[PDB]
Enzyme design. Structure first.
Site, PDB file in Angstrom:
ATOM      1  N   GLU A   1       0.822  -1.201   0.000  1.00  0.00           N
ATOM      2  CA  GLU A   1       0.000   0.000   0.000  1.00  0.00           C
ATOM      3  C   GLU A   1       0.858   1.254   0.000  1.00  0.00           C
ATOM      4  O   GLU A   1       0.446   2.286  -0.540  1.00  0.00           O
ATOM      5  CB  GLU A   1      -0.930   0.004   1.213  1.00  0.00           C
ATOM      6  CG  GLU A   1      -2.010   1.072   1.165  1.00  0.00           C
ATOM      7  CD  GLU A   1      -2.651   1.320   2.513  1.00  0.00           C
ATOM      8  OE1 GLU A   1      -3.112   0.347   3.142  1.00  0.00           O
ATOM      9  OE2 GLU A   1      -2.688   2.489   2.947  1.00  0.00           O
ATOM     10  N   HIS A   2       2.045   1.190   0.605  1.00  0.00           N
ATOM     11  CA  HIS A   2       2.878   2.389   0.649  1.00  0.00           C
ATOM     12  C   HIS A   2       3.388   2.799  -0.732  1.00  0.00           C
ATOM     13  O   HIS A   2       3.540   3.997  -0.994  1.00  0.00           O
ATOM     14  CB  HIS A   2       4.048   2.195   1.607  1.00  0.00           C
ATOM     15  CG  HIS A   2       3.732   2.581   3.018  1.00  0.00           C
ATOM     16  ND1 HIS A   2       2.843   1.876   3.797  1.00  0.00           N
ATOM     17  CD2 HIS A   2       4.174   3.606   3.784  1.00  0.00           C
ATOM     18  CE1 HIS A   2       2.756   2.445   4.986  1.00  0.00           C
ATOM     19  NE2 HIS A   2       3.554   3.496   5.005  1.00  0.00           N
TER      20      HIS A   2
ATOM     21  N   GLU B   1       8.314   5.542  10.836  1.00  0.00           N
ATOM     22  CA  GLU B   1       6.926   5.668  11.255  1.00  0.00           C
ATOM     23  C   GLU B   1       6.593   4.733  12.411  1.00  0.00           C
ATOM     24  O   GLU B   1       5.629   4.984  13.142  1.00  0.00           O
ATOM     25  CB  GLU B   1       6.071   5.383  10.021  1.00  0.00           C
ATOM     26  CG  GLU B   1       4.564   5.485  10.104  1.00  0.00           C
ATOM     27  CD  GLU B   1       3.955   5.741   8.736  1.00  0.00           C
ATOM     28  OE1 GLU B   1       4.016   4.832   7.879  1.00  0.00           O
ATOM     29  OE2 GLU B   1       3.434   6.852   8.509  1.00  0.00           O
TER      30      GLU B   1
END
Ligand code: CDL
Ligand code: PEE
Lengths: 137, 418, 182, 77, 418, 114
Positions: free
Chosen positions: A25-26, A102
């Protein structure tokens, strides 16, 4: 609004690749063979359209918001994304660094923490106990 | 099937639209807000929006609360500096009694001493949850810096006033500003005859206009707030244009040329001039964008930045310079067309949902004699030239600035040295 | 249990096992939820569905000296619904559920999303009329029955984070899932 | 005239600050009892934003709107 | 019998005077203060002046406290933005042990974690008693408005910093600013040989100079604080002159022409130009006067007013106009001579008591190579002309203003419209 | 007793009768005072002299829930001095009194007044 919904999520991953979907998804919107690099982003932004995605314990989704006039392009782009992402080593390493950064700092809300803990204790020893992001290791 | 504007002898405006939706929505909109307060009764309107379930001459507080719950409905209150709105949502057939409640809440409130005095301590709590997001208190300071009197007044109650707003102030404000010629009633999911039956109850309410207020006067202010936070927030604006003006359309297109906000999840915003400028001045996380407000007798345009504390001076400058290049007339047809695309599309998306559509119609009804359909808005957008955009940029560059900053300001610049 | 007495407030979540997407019972359960949802700052009830299983429970935040009372109140409401429900409240819950269903589907995005999720989970789009017909059948007897079928005398899953010294012991929580006077 | 006191006259006691240490033999003027300020509401802690992807979209583009409802959380634009 | 200045090889200055008084006073004076802080360690010096009885390498806290009490003595600490002073009072024969205490407090402090962390909550309390008198917080804001960096820093700790000043910060500040070439030791009631015996213990302390700091930069600021108070306080200044300058004497005489403060109990202040001007603009209670500060690299001159909230605009203007008439050269020999009388007499009265006399000598010792006797000061006063006073008034009128106001500001003017 | 439960804090004063200006005993009393002067915000001891009489006592400010304890502490110190005083503290009080006397007479005004 037009999208593709996919019957895949974290409860189909094993401990060897737990966290793969979030990784994918990134770098979903980062380039295709037909549209290298930021060309895809520039074409989405020149229509005035919006592009979004998400990932769940059980589902995945990519959709676009646009004007009704743009349906032929929309679908085109939407098909280009799900079949022809360019998984380049440089971009993979950039996303790796971003996700590690993150995860390093306590960037999680307490609500998310307790709900993850609940799934872990309730469904222990079963695939549903595992998180969408996966471990940092 | 179309809208139908209409005005009663009282001066009240009414409009409706029978979309065949299962959920009906009715809004009562009023020319009121914080700009009509003065230094002797600040915070009145905040408590007023919180007091929207105290007892009335027509129905008990217990009755209002439980009766609205028993059908599943909602009664919201929303304000700005210039307008207030009371909105009701209900299933088909529920209207009548909820409309009685609306009437009593707006035309016949009691402000019993003990209920008001039990309601006071919630101002603190509401303001606290609002002030968790840092953007809100920065924008509040920006209005204080930008204006001397009226648009300067705060949306949330001042701290020194909590516990000392009185019932008499509430009564006075309602009596002098909740007047029929300041009002419109809008209905989605409702046939005009039915909305006429509703508006009929408002025929004997307070008539005419009220106290008109004062015009806003510009200040070239500057407010600095020092905290320990490693991230610093900043806003830099000038005065631009009045609501509903061609020049305001020019300023909007300029905003979208500079960059108004993201479009791709986790994207690089390659189309955005401000973001790409800044990205070459700092290597740690930043945010930047352009800012627009417009009012009845003024407006503000500028830039908004978030950066590390040691990088602020480099970021704020890098952003500002970008605007200047447009003022000198480095501007391209391609950028302008793309900006107008962003703007037309964003506008049409903003009104998919009935909630925002009702708001937009109610905003128009308080200021214009007829409803403007979106096609006309899109044409007005289409009609902005390049020269208008460049002129707007020159106005910003030339005019007197106002600035706010919050964080650790050891390296933030002062408005005089930009 | 993750204890950290420096955090301002205690967060707590407690569930039992729900039935999953396919079962009918979900509707009735939602009604129950709407009936339940002062002591503390924040509180919610939830249902989380999967293909063959789910979580049905509640989440709340408290000051550290008011965890026990809040757990007592919550489990007492559960027992109440299992044993003593009445028609008047059930009606209100059904109306709340109607309003939620129709409020959610506003604008294209939520509708598109509903189409996709529905075709993955159900195999078919379920129209609002069918949902209304399913809602109309619930009554206090149905609520009593189904709440008993999933909540009463069951072992829960618990999670806590914060200053949670006063979070009751697991045996004390398990004993709260049944009444001795019933 | 190079001390603050010799120069400034009646503004010296606001242009200067002092703390008289362990208690002395004479008794001072302006004793000043202390009704201190009450504590604000206690709140949850703040999360950081240590990535561009997390800060993206935080900057303000339009002024704010204040909202409340009888069965809905209070909200700000 | 006279003073005797002297400097040791370390660079430490020492001076003394054997007045045959029963009570001996010794002061240690240091070039330190809030102007040497920066945005990352604000409030350090406040806690530093409160920490003056925590334990040291040479004596326990219990020992210091009880030992000073047991002889009846006192140890004070006084600061400004530019200097700090530790002073000891004792009966004849008590010196030696108290001097050991002074040495350990200034040259060898421990800042034990637990004692510092138990001392923190007293900052709040001290600041509160300070901020009961309204003048203090107004002057604090005036410095923030007037300067961008250094003289802007506050004397009292910022609220966000209370509870988060650390031991490491205290150690660093002392190590980098409590240095022998920044110091003087002054003794009244003490023979030079004895004060030499005392200074002997300071021979092996930290040598040389320290971190020199930054020069103050002027801001044309404005700060407004809104409360409900019916009385409003205001200050309006510009930049004037450096400490120890002829032009500063000019400004002093100007202050005393305008009016510096009362002389008769319950008087009408008929000699005061500002008071008589204002008395004709308002009929309810007011206060007005003129304001002077001077520093090492800057200075401020202006006016200070207190009035009713609705009268402020009339008062502030009436005061300002008065100054302007002097700038235009309405000034009289008689007024000037009377002002110089007030100034010479006030100066000589300010140093009757040994406490203030010690302060004055210590202030001189940090900045000059020799002590200036009062006769010389009186002559320097005598040497100001009328033209100097008028020039000073013109400087004030022409230069960029800074302003602060606090109260209910519904009628206070903005700095741009004066 | 003047009761007003809206004021933040309670003020209290308690005296006995002192001997007046002329008597010698004053000196000793002052020493006693210096020996006496935590619970509350503010506290003081005092002697007020007249020609033939006077007031000898103490004054303090308290939170409303801590008046009783403070009165207990004060009266206990009084009883202590009456029954159990010792040399070591007395010496300290004498030194405090010396320092006060010499500190007051600084500058012309206080001296003229004296
Ligand atoms: C001696 C040696 C000593 C040394 C030994 C050393 C070793 C010792 C080690 C061990 C130490 C142990 C220490 C104690 C631990 C206690 C734990 C505890 O309290 O946990 C709290 C436990 C934890 O829950 P919680 O978190 O607090 O939540 C509270 C909720 O409300 C929860 O709600 P809920 O609905 O789940 O539960 C509530 C309900 C749950 O209980 C029930 O609903 C019923 C339970 C089973 C049936 C019991 C019925 C008894 C009725 C009375 C006797 C008559 C019986 C029939 C014969 C009729 C004759 C005419 O209980 C109650 O409401 C309490 C009262 C229940 C009985 C009702 C009668 C009250 C009056 C009693 C006196 C009567 C006298 C006259 C009698 C007639 C004339 C002779 O909750 C409780 O409330 C537990 C209740 C315990 C009740 C015990 C009753 C004993 C007394 C019986 C009667 C005695 C007299 C008989 C006279 C002769 C006639 C037969
Ligand atoms: C006389 C010689 C006897 C020799 C044999 C051994 C004797 C000792 C045996 C043990 C006796 C224990 C007495 C004390 C009660 C112990 C209760 C216990 O362990 O269970 C705990 C449990 C508490 O429930 P929780 O799950 O913790 O909370 C639920 C909340 N929703 O206790 C209960 O069941 C409480 C309810 C009452 C139960 C009955 C109490 C005893 C009395 C019942 C009979 C009444 C008639 C008595 C007549 C006596 C003669 C006149």
């Amino acid at each position: 609004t037009v999208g593709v919904w996919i019957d895949v999520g974290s409860r189909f991953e094993t401990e060897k690749n737990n966290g793969a979907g979030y990784f994918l998804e990134h770098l979903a919107f980062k380039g295709t063979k037909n549209r290298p690099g930021s060309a895809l982003e520039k074409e989405v932004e020149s229509m005035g359209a919006h592009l979004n995605a998400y990932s769940t314990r059980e589902h995945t989704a990519y959709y676009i918001k646009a004007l009704s006039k743009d349906l032929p392009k929309v679908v085109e782009l939407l098909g280009d994304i799900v079949q022809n992402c360019s998984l380049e080593d440089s971009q993979i390493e950039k996303e790796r660094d971003v996700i590690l950064r993150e995860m390093q700092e306590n960037d999680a809300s307490m609500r998310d923490v307790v709900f993850d803990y609940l799934h872990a204790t309730a469904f222990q020893g079963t695939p549903l106990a595992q998180t969408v992001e996966g471990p940092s290791e | 099937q179309d809208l139908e504007f209409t005005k009663l002898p009282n001066g009240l405006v009414i409009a409706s639209l029978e979309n065949y939706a299962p959920l009906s929505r009715i809004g009562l909109f009023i020319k009121a807000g914080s700009r009509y307060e003065d230094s002797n009764n600040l915070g009145t309107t905040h408590l007023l929006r919180l007091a929207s379930s105290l007892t009335t001459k027509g129905a008990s507080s217990f009755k209002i609360t439980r009766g609205i719950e028993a059908v599943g409905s909602k009664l919201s209150v929303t304000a700005t500096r210039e307008t207030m709105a009371y909105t009701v949502e209900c299933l088909r057939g529920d209207v009548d009694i909820l409309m009685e409640f609306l009437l009593n809440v707006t035309t016949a409130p009691e402000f019993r001493r003990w209920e008001v005095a039990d309601l006071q301590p919630q101002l603190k709590i509401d303001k606290a949850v609002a002030f968790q997001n840092p953007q809100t208190h920065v924008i509040e300071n920006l209005h204080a810096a930008a204006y001397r009197n009226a648009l300067a007044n705060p949306l949330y109650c001042p701290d020194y006033r909590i516990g000392k707003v009185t019932s008499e102030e509430l009564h006075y404000f309602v009596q002098n500003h909740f007047t029929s010629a300041r009002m419109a009633l809008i209905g989605l999911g409702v046939s005009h005859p039915v909305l006429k039956q509703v508006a009929e109850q408002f025929l004997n309410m307070r008539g005419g206009f009220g106290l008109s207020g004062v015009k806003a006067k510009y200040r070239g202010g500057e407010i600095r707030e020092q905290n320990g936070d490693s991230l610093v927030h900043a806003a830099l604006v000038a005065e631009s244009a009045v609501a509903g003006s061609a020049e305001a359309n020019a300023f909007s297109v300029l905003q979208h040329v500079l960059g108004a906000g993201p479009h791709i999840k986790r994207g690089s915003n390659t189309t955005s001039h401000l973001y790409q400028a800044v990205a070459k001045a700092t290597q740690q996380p930043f945010d930047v964008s352009a800012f627009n407000a417009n009012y009845s007798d003024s407006g503000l345009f500028g830039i908004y930045t978030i950066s590390q504390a040691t990088a602020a001076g480099d970021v704020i400058k890098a952003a500002y310079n970008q605007v200047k290049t447009i003022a000198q007339g480095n501007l391209s047809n391609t950028d302008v067309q793309a900006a107008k695309n962003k703007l037309k599309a964003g506008y049409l998306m903003s009104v998919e949902s009935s909630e925002r559509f009702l708001e937009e119609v109610g905003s128009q009804a308080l200021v214009a004699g007829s409803y403007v359909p979106p096609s006309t808005v899109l044409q007005q957008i289409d009609s902005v030239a390049n020269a208008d955009v460049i002129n707007a940029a020159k106005k910003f560059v030339s005019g007197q600035k106002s600035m706010v900053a919050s964080g650790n300001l050891g390296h933030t610049p002062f408005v005089d040295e930009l | 249990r993750h204890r950290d007495d420096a955090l301002p407030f205690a967060h707590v979540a407690i569930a039992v096992e729900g039935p999953g997407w396919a079962s009918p019972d979900n509707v009735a359960l939602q009604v129950a939820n709407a009936i339940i949802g002062k002591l503390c700052q924040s509180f919610q009830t939830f249902s989380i569905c999967y293909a063959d299983t789910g979580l049905l429970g509640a989440h709340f935040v408290c000051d550290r000296m008011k965890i026990d009372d809040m757990m007592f109140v919550l489990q007492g409401q559960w027992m109440r619904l299992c044993t003593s429900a009445t028609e008047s409240e059930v009606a209100r819950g059904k109306n709340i559920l109607r309003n939620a269903l129709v409020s959610h589907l506003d604008g294209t995005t939520p509708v598109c999303e509903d189409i996709g999720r529905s075709l993955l989970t159900y195999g078919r789009r379920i129209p609002l009329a069918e949902w209304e017909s399913r809602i109309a059948e619930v009554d206090a007897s149905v609520v009593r029955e189904i709440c008993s079928k999933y909540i009463y005398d069951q072992c829960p899953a618990v999670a806590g984070y914060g200053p949670i010294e006063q979070l009751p012991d697991y045996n004390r929580i398990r004993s709260g899932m049944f009444w001795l006077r019933f | 005239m190079l001390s603050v006191a010799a120069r400034s006259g009646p503004f010296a006691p606001v242009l200067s600050a002092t703390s008289r240490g362990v208690a002395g033999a004479l008794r001072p003027l302006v004793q000043a009892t202390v009704p201190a300020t009450p504590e604000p509401p206690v709140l949850d802690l703040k999360r950081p934003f240590l990535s561009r992807e997390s800060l993206s979209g935080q900057a303000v583009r339009r002024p704010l709107v204040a909202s409340v409802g009888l069965n809905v959380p209070a909200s700000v634009c």
